[PDB]
Amino acid sequence: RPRFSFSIAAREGKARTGTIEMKRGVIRTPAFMPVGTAATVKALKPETVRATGADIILGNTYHLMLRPGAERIAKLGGLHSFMGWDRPILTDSGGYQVMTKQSEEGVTFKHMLSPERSIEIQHLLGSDIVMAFDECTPYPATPSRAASSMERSMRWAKRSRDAFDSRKEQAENAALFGIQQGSVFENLRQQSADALAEIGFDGYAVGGLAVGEGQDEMFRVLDFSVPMLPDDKPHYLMGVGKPDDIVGAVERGIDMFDCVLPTRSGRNGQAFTWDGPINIRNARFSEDLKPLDSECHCAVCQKWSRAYIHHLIRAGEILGAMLMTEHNIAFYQQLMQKIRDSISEGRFSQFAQDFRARYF
Amino acid sequence: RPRFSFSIAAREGKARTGTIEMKRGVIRTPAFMPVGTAATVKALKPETVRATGADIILGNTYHLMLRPGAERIAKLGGLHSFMGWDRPILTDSGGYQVMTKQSEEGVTFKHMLSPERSIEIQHLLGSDIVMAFDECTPYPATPSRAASSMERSMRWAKRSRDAFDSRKEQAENAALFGIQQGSVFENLRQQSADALAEIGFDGYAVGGLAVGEGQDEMFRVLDFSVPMLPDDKPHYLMGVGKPDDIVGAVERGIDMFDCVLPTRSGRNGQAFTWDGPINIRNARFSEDLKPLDSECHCAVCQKWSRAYIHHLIRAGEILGAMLMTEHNIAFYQQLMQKIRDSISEGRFSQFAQDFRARYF
Numbered sequence A, B: 001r002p003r004f005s006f007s008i009a010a011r012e013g014k015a016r017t018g019t020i021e022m023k024r025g026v027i028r029t030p031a032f033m034p035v036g037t038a039a040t041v042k043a044l045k046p047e048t049v050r051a052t053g054a055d056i057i058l059g060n061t062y063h064l065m066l067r068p069g070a071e072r073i074a075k076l077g078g079l080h081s082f083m084g085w086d087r088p089i090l091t092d093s094g095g096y097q098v099m100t101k102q103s104e105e106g107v108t109f110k111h112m113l114s115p116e117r118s119i120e121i122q123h124l125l126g127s128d129i130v131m132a133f134d135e136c137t138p139y140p141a142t143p144s145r146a147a148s149s150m151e152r153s154m155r156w157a158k159r160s161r162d163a164f165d166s167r168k169e170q171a172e173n174a175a176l177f178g179i180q181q182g183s184v185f186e187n188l189r190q191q192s193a194d195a196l197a198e199i200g201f202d203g204y205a206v207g208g209l210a211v212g213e214g215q216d217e218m219f220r221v222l223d224f225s226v227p228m229l230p231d232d233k234p235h236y237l238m239g240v241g242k243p244d245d246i247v248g249a250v251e252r253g254i255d256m257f258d259c260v261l262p263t264r265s266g267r268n269g270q271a272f273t274w275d276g277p278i279n280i281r282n283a284r285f286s287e288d289l290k291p292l293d294s295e296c297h298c299a300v301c302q303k304w305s306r307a308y309i310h311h312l313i314r315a316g317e318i319l320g321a322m323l324m325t326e327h328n329i330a331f332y333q334q335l336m337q338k339i340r341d342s343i344s345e346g347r348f349s350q351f352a353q354d355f356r357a358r359y360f
């Protein structure tokens, strides 16, 4: 495979489906990327993560540079070998999870991170998709503050580009995505997009959302922001999200997603189903012999009842977390698969309508 | 298969290897039985428990009659269906884990348990091997107190026998083991053995050990106690134990074992190896790329390093508990397999010697 190749196989409106080819494998888009926060997708072996249909996972940099350390993972052969995942890994740049003394050089915190060091750490980890080091602007933000932050992010985006390119092994084997900022303001999003395209990246994330603004506002910002990005490159919406957020963002041109919700919200008792989320701890499930979801093809739904998983989560048993997480990540992969197939077949707007009617 | 058939294929000294055939499967002896404390072997899917080589698991009654409840599990189709384990299950009688108002009728506690109710609960759970309801005499015990307790246990053993036999479905499909008491006193062990043999059971446990007496004392008691039991029936040492305790008890005629050590001690960071236990949290493992144990055939040792599992346990990650538990239970199964093969081949005393030289 090439270092990086994105091909669009089909479109419907602003939605696209395709593939990203990279040395360690192919990524089907639109993609949902399970999150590891300490070199593990919580409660799952990597073979299980793969079996659910994941093509790529997200490595949580901030936690790794602290524990176990970037230099240490490198000495041990890199993150892929360390955790036993041999397919692509996207790493965030750390410029969110830290936010501390902030300067134009970078951030020091309760340690230092700069564009250069972030890119280096992602290199030590053996990341396949490297994120530029950005500032994720707090919400709400005044226009002046959103602009100052965006501007700094764009300067940092150029420093990221040049650090990456200045490391031959990384430049030849990994990909680099830039991150658009600008809060909810169209003119700053446009300036950000322009600056990023001028620098040039392998992919473009929409950053600064999923920071408490609410679905209507996020979709509004996506309406004008995603078309500002190069069409022929992948669009990653960072930190999104719930099933419904995913469908509406694909409708707005996003190709890639990460959420901690399916893992997080699963160990908490929330299970996703096509009729909406359920909280399996609810007493109503205590004698319910049905699987978590009636159509789901995952191994959990093949083998265990709601009543058992209810008992497990209520009891604080680790297998409860294992099964809820497997199910939720499988659910998400099956959602992505239905989205891809529906776009390929030119019926995604109908799918999205049918999905929402039932989910709500 | 029959309801219950124990066949001895080979012997060496007091050690025996063979098979127990029951309707839900065959149990290779000497046997190690992983423990579930709430209808789960902690951190493992049943398919994983099986893959490690377990032929039978132990259902933790005390926890189940409280959570989720015996009647509830019965309504849901029984423990096998509920937890997804279709092979034999041995259940303890609850007469240990409770110890509260104690009487000749049974015990009430912070609920009631009597010989009759214990047998009924094990029935509701769908247990394959039912344990008699006993009193596990505290250690140390004076001779008078050990005798009083033993005597009560034997009366309860007759009540257990008769409750079991009085329930046709249970009597036809399950097995019943009696439990010898008598603390560390030979004459009370003998009285207990006689009383139990007179009643007659499918198997005989040695109870009242693993209660803080220490290996030398436990082995001393086993030296005289196990020969008192019917030779042609299985001998179960309850609550034992460490790898070394297992080898010496097989040398003394025990066929079956349960310990919470491999599960318990695994999530705590203790890993069993043929060179003895290691605590994987120790800093010395932080960059150790070797598997937990150098010969172990388990999937954990095939795929992950000490350094990674060290990181996981240090980080409190659930996959750390999953991998340490899989390894430790696999280790134990491989121990049992080496014990069985060595007895079958008439070299178990050499195995035991070689095992100890290296383990210590």
Ligand SMILES: Nc1nc2c(CCc3ccccc3)c3nc[nH]c3cc2c(=O)[nH]1
Residues within 6 Å of the ligand: A035, A058, A059, A060, A061, A090, A091, A092, A093, A094, A095, A096, A097, A131, A134, A135, A136, A137, A179, A206, A207, A208, A209, A210, A211, A238, A239, A240, A258
């Ligand atoms: N770099 C960056 N990250 C964000 C994350 C973390 C996503 C992440 C990816 C991979 C691993 C961990 C975390 C956000 N989460 C919610 N909203 C978010 C916004 C941003 C952002 O604007 N920039």
Ligand SMILES: Nc1nc2c(CCc3ccccc3)c3nc[nH]c3cc2c(=O)[nH]1
Residues within 6 Å of the ligand: B035, B058, B059, B060, B061, B090, B091, B092, B093, B094, B095, B096, B097, B131, B134, B135, B136, B137, B179, B206, B207, B208, B209, B210, B211, B238, B239, B240, B258
């Ligand atoms: N009934 C009984 N149980 C014991 C257990 C629990 C084993 C058990 C089996 C199956 C499930 C849970 C617990 C002991 N543990 C350590 N020493 C023990 C002694 C006894 C005993 O004398 N009688």
Ligand SMILES: [Zn+2]
Residues within 6 Å of the ligand: A292, A293, A296, A297, A298, A299, A300, A301, A302, A327, A330, A331
């Ligand atoms: Zn499912």
Ligand SMILES: [Zn+2]
Residues within 6 Å of the ligand: B292, B293, B296, B297, B298, B299, B300, B301, B302, B327, B330, B331
């Ligand atoms: Zn192993």
